[PDB]
RNA sequence: GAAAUUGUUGAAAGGGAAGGGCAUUUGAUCAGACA
RNA sequence: GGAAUACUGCCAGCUGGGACUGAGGACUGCGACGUAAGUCAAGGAUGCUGGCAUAAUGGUUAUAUGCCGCCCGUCUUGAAACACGGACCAAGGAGUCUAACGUCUAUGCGAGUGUUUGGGUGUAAAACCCAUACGCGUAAUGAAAGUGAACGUAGGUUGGGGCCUCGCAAGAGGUGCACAAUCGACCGAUCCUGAUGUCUUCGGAUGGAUUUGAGUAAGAGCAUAGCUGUUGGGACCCGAAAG
RNA sequence: AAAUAUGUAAGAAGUCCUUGUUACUUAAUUGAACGUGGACAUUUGAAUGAAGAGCUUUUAGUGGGCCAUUUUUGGUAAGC
């Protein structure tokens, strides 16, 4: 009789999609990606800053 | 007959209500409303009166008093959304106030108990007020908007 | 007569399995998506390290909004706008990109705005404005059994299964996407950018492929 | 009756449902069957091919009566025997005694041969017969006796 | 607005009760729309519609057309249903037994059937014996044997019979009906 | 195409299924890594107005 | 004993027509529902 | 070398102010929180408090004020038109009835149908009853003389609802009315063919043909009634100059 | 020799095997047409859509048109 927005009614959010509970519990929406440091070839940098 | 009469009548059975889902949960008050805080009364009989806040009652109202001997306002209920909570604050650790609830204002002039309750509270408070100079005078004088005052700007 | 709780038991328990299945499935896709996204990120970087260039695959899925009202429209575009189910302004549908639809898009550019939608805007499109076609009618999604009922034949028994089919352009995208009733957006909240809609995006207008800038818009209309 | 009629419904609309432009006027195409060969020829050839001009012989003072001659096919035939009597003759199909049917007395003038009669013998009295009728009749061991 | 792609507020175009005003007809319909809603048997669904049919879409099935249908291979014991009147036909000389279930039987038909020791059943008696229409053989009559349809599609080279009152030589057999008078058809 | 569709089918069926023999439109192309090695980018700009005539 | 149209009485409004629509002030006037 | 920050994007991160709405009316669903009992914001508002209990709210009306609003009817591509009729008001004031019809529909009976020219009868223009004919239908085709509808289970083929059989089901087969397509057979016309025979010119079997018919091929009509349509009638109403 | 327009095709009324009918046709049971019997199901044969599709009867009004972008004829031109 009345459509309820999962995006802003936590109950039906958890009704569709049970993963919402664990997503939120594991923050997950702010995941810290692996810190790696590959550096680009000077080819790349040269031609980026070329004329 | 003047008019035929229908083939169908309504039942006159009232239905029952659907079982509603509306829990009465408690009113958390805005942070500026701690007891001891001085309120400006925005409306009502004692509008623009400056007044000490004492207790949050169970009907959400606020218990205030003048004190009565200062500015003539008695122990009273006031509605939180008609009230500017100032930033100036008396301690209220010496004011009992337990006694005071909704039933205490059951309509049903003035009861001697009220007149005495008023005195016991007000004395604790006055004792306190006197600690900070000019507060009493403050408390005893109506607030108003002076030309140029811009509420959405002033700090209270 | 039993049943009371007896066949209430046969079912609530049965319902519980089904959620578990969804719980592990939606947990799956989360992995699916992250490591997909990350792999591309690492692709780019790996190729730069190597003095090369990682050119992403072209997008296989777009999202079209009809942007033009209903009158004064040539017949060829018209038909197409119907076949893509855009028959009123600000309504939108998903389209799988191949040569044979790509041309269709080409044909209606003056009248639409379209682009590559993100996971985020497909999710919020589906969660809020997403309705099924069920012996016609157009039924809100809002419970997962509505989907399993009609889309379950194809795998697909949750609102997130739906989203997952769309975004990855699954083997059963036709059924999954046709099931979706044309989304009905409001006009953009922020406004349109632009003072005139009916030039191409590129010329300061609103229509055409505007690529990843389609999410900014759709969100303001969803 | 008038109350069910569409002029009741047109009351209050100007043109009585016959157009503002092209009115309802007296006789636009002419009267009657006017123009059959001119402005009404498309309707005539198509819908009435054959209409204009002549064929065959005139016959002055033709008297339909002369040619009176209703057909009855074998198709019925057994109908001209009353039911009761009929069943009685079907069973006991035989020379020596077979039913006499005066088809003139039933007011037909020719027996034609539409389709199958059981093998029972009939004696059939008629003014005329198709070759087939008379053939099919003998094939059941009946005959045709010519009357008038 | 909506670029419509289909005419709005369209009526499905199917009779949905009969136009007839007969109590009894309405009751038979009461019977069968119940059976059609609660028996998933296609027969009940077909019969319900046939009851709405106007007189024309209900040509009379004959007793001889009935007798033939029973000479169908493996069909001689079936009960023929006819949603309409059933007429007699002197042209058949031998009639089977069986059980015809119908709206009306003419005097001659009901006799012929009963004379060979058959049964004439009304559709509602038919229902009580065959609620799923078991073992029934539905027949319909010739719709396009009507005189009217002769004249449908009248035009050049269609061969369809003039709407004509008097007929004979010199009633529409000349110019445009033969090579020697203008042209032909 | 039929003659061939009959082939790929028999060739499949009596092996261990997996067919796919409807036609499909041009798919968009996939990812790819273009190398620079042998082929650094040359940089063009636009050219001025001229008249040759 | 209608209407056009008229006299009187009462009330109103009126800076080169009048009448109308949405809305509310103001005056006048009134139904219902309370128990 | 190591940070920051901007920019863009994400979060099923938290959170404040404001507005409109509160359809529904026992329960039934999907859920959420809880060790649990319970609880809940989970298939649509309840709780608490006050004021009035009447012109207070509301309706009607006149006026005032803001914005807006050209005279309707008509013919026209286009009218508020410097196009026409209309000063005002009442009362009359225009698609009818009839003969014969098409399509559709309802009803009666059905290879038939139609009592009402007439007769009988009557509580008298009614109602009730009826013999003989007639009409239309049940046969067509030829200008005519004239001839006249089964090779066959009243045909083969393809689709076909429904039904029948098998199968738990999906499906598979059997039969298949209406209807549609297609190829054939039958009757008349036309044109070939011309047996047995003959009051030697009659007779016309039989088998055929890019021909042809408003035909056969297990009948569908007859009658009353209605809306719409058709023709003739003063013919929707008013109108000539004329004869 | 374009662009725009435009014909057909994308299967069950389909493809393959076996070998019947005739007065047509072949030097020829050769062919042509129509068949009987057998082999293979929905990735059965591109996309997108499909408030379904097909069919039948009868009848109104209408048969002065005007405008805009583009193509365009006559005219110096025109609110032609
Ligand atoms: Mg509750
Ligand atoms: Mg709170
Ligand atoms: Mg004082
Ligand atoms: Mg699409
Ligand atoms: Mg915004
Ligand atoms: Mg704004
Ligand atoms: Mg903003
Ligand atoms: Mg502008
Ligand atoms: Mg929004
Ligand atoms: Mg009439
Ligand atoms: Mg009347
Ligand atoms: Mg009426
Ligand atoms: Mg009307
Ligand atoms: Mg009216
Ligand atoms: Mg009108
Ligand atoms: Mg009309
Ligand atoms: Mg007029
Ligand atoms: Mg004539
Ligand atoms: Mg006959
Ligand atoms: Mg006939
Ligand atoms: Mg000719
Ligand atoms: Mg008088
Ligand atoms: Mg007044
Ligand atoms: Mg007003
Ligand atoms: Mg309510
Ligand atoms: Mg309610
Ligand atoms: Mg009072
Ligand atoms: Mg009152
Ligand atoms: Mg009051
Ligand atoms: Mg006024
Ligand atoms: Mg104005
Ligand atoms: Mg005019
Ligand atoms: Mg003019
Ligand atoms: Mg003018
Ligand atoms: Mg004039
Ligand atoms: Mg005048
Ligand atoms: Mg007037
Ligand atoms: Mg009048
Ligand atoms: Mg009497
Ligand atoms: Mg008399
Ligand atoms: Mg009598
Ligand atoms: Mg007599
Ligand atoms: Mg006759
Ligand atoms: Mg006839
Ligand atoms: Mg002769
Ligand atoms: Mg004749
Ligand atoms: Mg064949
Ligand atoms: Mg079958
Ligand atoms: Mg078969
Ligand atoms: Mg012939
Ligand atoms: Mg001829
Ligand atoms: Mg005829
Ligand atoms: Mg007339
Ligand atoms: Mg005169
Ligand atoms: Mg005169
Ligand atoms: Mg004269
Ligand atoms: Mg094309
Ligand atoms: Mg589809
Ligand atoms: Mg549909
Ligand atoms: Mg028409
Ligand atoms: Mg017309
Ligand atoms: Mg016309
Ligand atoms: Mg005209």
mmCIF file of N, CA, C and O in Angstrom, chain B residues 97-123:
data_model
loop_
_atom_site.group_PDB
_atom_site.id
_atom_site.type_symbol
_atom_site.label_atom_id
_atom_site.label_comp_id
_atom_site.label_asym_id
_atom_site.label_seq_id
_atom_site.Cartn_x
_atom_site.Cartn_y
_atom_site.Cartn_z
ATOM 1 N N UNK B 97 13.307 19.343 44.061
ATOM 2 C CA UNK B 97 12.612 19.226 42.790
ATOM 3 C C UNK B 97 11.983 17.830 42.506
ATOM 4 O O UNK B 97 11.087 17.723 41.665
ATOM 5 N N UNK B 98 12.405 16.783 43.222
ATOM 6 C CA UNK B 98 11.821 15.442 43.072
ATOM 7 C C UNK B 98 10.293 15.431 43.101
ATOM 8 O O UNK B 98 9.621 14.831 42.244
ATOM 9 N N UNK B 99 9.771 16.086 44.135
ATOM 10 C CA UNK B 99 8.343 16.302 44.337
ATOM 11 C C UNK B 99 7.504 16.568 43.066
ATOM 12 O O UNK B 99 6.345 16.179 42.991
ATOM 13 N N UNK B 100 8.109 17.205 42.067
ATOM 14 C CA UNK B 100 7.380 17.939 41.034
ATOM 15 C C UNK B 100 7.123 17.165 39.779
ATOM 16 O O UNK B 100 8.063 16.865 39.058
ATOM 17 N N UNK B 101 5.856 16.895 39.487
ATOM 18 C CA UNK B 101 5.510 16.129 38.306
ATOM 19 C C UNK B 101 4.256 16.634 37.627
ATOM 20 O O UNK B 101 3.808 17.747 37.893
ATOM 21 N N UNK B 102 3.672 15.808 36.764
ATOM 22 C CA UNK B 102 2.526 16.258 35.995
ATOM 23 C C UNK B 102 1.332 16.383 36.879
ATOM 24 O O UNK B 102 0.575 17.346 36.764
ATOM 25 N N UNK B 103 1.168 15.421 37.785
ATOM 26 C CA UNK B 103 0.002 15.408 38.667
ATOM 27 C C UNK B 103 -0.007 16.655 39.527
ATOM 28 O O UNK B 103 -1.070 17.198 39.837
ATOM 29 N N UNK B 104 1.180 17.126 39.887
ATOM 30 C CA UNK B 104 1.306 18.341 40.674
ATOM 31 C C UNK B 104 0.618 19.554 40.024
ATOM 32 O O UNK B 104 0.410 20.574 40.682
ATOM 33 N N UNK B 105 0.254 19.459 38.750
ATOM 34 C CA UNK B 105 -0.489 20.552 38.137
ATOM 35 C C UNK B 105 -1.900 20.099 37.651
ATOM 36 O O UNK B 105 -2.516 20.687 36.776
ATOM 37 N N UNK B 106 -2.421 19.059 38.276
ATOM 38 C CA UNK B 106 -3.821 18.682 38.101
ATOM 39 C C UNK B 106 -4.784 19.824 38.448
ATOM 40 O O UNK B 106 -5.019 20.081 39.648
ATOM 41 N N UNK B 107 -5.349 20.480 37.420
ATOM 42 C CA UNK B 107 -6.378 21.541 37.608
ATOM 43 C C UNK B 107 -7.350 21.314 38.794
ATOM 44 O O UNK B 107 -7.366 22.101 39.753
ATOM 45 N N UNK B 108 -8.127 20.229 38.714
ATOM 46 C CA UNK B 108 -9.104 19.812 39.738
ATOM 47 C C UNK B 108 -9.777 20.969 40.487
ATOM 48 O O UNK B 108 -9.743 21.042 41.724
ATOM 49 N N UNK B 109 -8.156 30.802 45.405
ATOM 50 C CA UNK B 109 -6.955 30.869 44.564
ATOM 51 C C UNK B 109 -5.911 29.775 44.884
ATOM 52 O O UNK B 109 -6.007 28.670 44.342
ATOM 53 N N UNK B 110 -4.924 30.059 45.740
ATOM 54 C CA UNK B 110 -3.710 29.244 45.695
ATOM 55 C C UNK B 110 -3.507 28.318 46.874
ATOM 56 O O UNK B 110 -3.612 28.755 48.009
ATOM 57 N N UNK B 111 -3.197 27.045 46.600
ATOM 58 C CA UNK B 111 -2.949 26.072 47.666
ATOM 59 C C UNK B 111 -1.714 26.453 48.509
ATOM 60 O O UNK B 111 -0.679 26.807 47.973
ATOM 61 N N UNK B 112 -1.833 26.396 49.828
ATOM 62 C CA UNK B 112 -0.724 26.776 50.697
ATOM 63 C C UNK B 112 0.539 25.979 50.386
ATOM 64 O O UNK B 112 1.652 26.508 50.529
ATOM 65 N N UNK B 113 0.373 24.719 49.970
ATOM 66 C CA UNK B 113 1.519 23.864 49.639
ATOM 67 C C UNK B 113 2.298 24.475 48.503
ATOM 68 O O UNK B 113 3.534 24.531 48.545
ATOM 69 N N UNK B 114 1.584 24.923 47.477
ATOM 70 C CA UNK B 114 2.241 25.582 46.361
ATOM 71 C C UNK B 114 3.093 26.726 46.929
ATOM 72 O O UNK B 114 4.311 26.704 46.813
ATOM 73 N N UNK B 115 2.439 27.663 47.609
ATOM 74 C CA UNK B 115 3.073 28.806 48.273
ATOM 75 C C UNK B 115 4.294 28.458 49.120
ATOM 76 O O UNK B 115 5.194 29.269 49.289
ATOM 77 N N UNK B 116 4.332 27.252 49.656
ATOM 78 C CA UNK B 116 5.473 26.849 50.448
ATOM 79 C C UNK B 116 6.527 26.172 49.596
ATOM 80 O O UNK B 116 7.715 26.475 49.743
ATOM 81 N N UNK B 117 6.094 25.277 48.703
ATOM 82 C CA UNK B 117 6.978 24.652 47.740
ATOM 83 C C UNK B 117 7.754 25.730 47.005
ATOM 84 O O UNK B 117 8.951 25.622 46.761
ATOM 85 N N UNK B 118 7.048 26.800 46.669
ATOM 86 C CA UNK B 118 7.637 27.912 45.965
ATOM 87 C C UNK B 118 8.715 28.543 46.794
ATOM 88 O O UNK B 118 9.708 29.024 46.268
ATOM 89 N N UNK B 119 8.538 28.552 48.101
ATOM 90 C CA UNK B 119 9.499 29.253 48.922
ATOM 91 C C UNK B 119 10.762 28.431 49.103
ATOM 92 O O UNK B 119 11.861 28.989 49.214
ATOM 93 N N UNK B 120 10.623 27.108 49.126
ATOM 94 C CA UNK B 120 11.773 26.270 49.486
ATOM 95 C C UNK B 120 12.768 26.163 48.357
ATOM 96 O O UNK B 120 13.977 26.244 48.570
ATOM 97 N N UNK B 121 12.219 25.956 47.161
ATOM 98 C CA UNK B 121 12.953 26.013 45.924
ATOM 99 C C UNK B 121 13.615 27.391 45.712
ATOM 100 O O UNK B 121 14.825 27.496 45.562
ATOM 101 N N UNK B 122 12.814 28.447 45.700
ATOM 102 C CA UNK B 122 13.317 29.787 45.471
ATOM 103 C C UNK B 122 14.446 30.210 46.434
ATOM 104 O O UNK B 122 15.305 31.024 46.114
ATOM 105 N N UNK B 123 14.450 29.667 47.634
ATOM 106 C CA UNK B 123 15.484 30.082 48.560
ATOM 107 C C UNK B 123 16.817 29.439 48.165
ATOM 108 O O UNK B 123 17.817 30.138 48.049
#
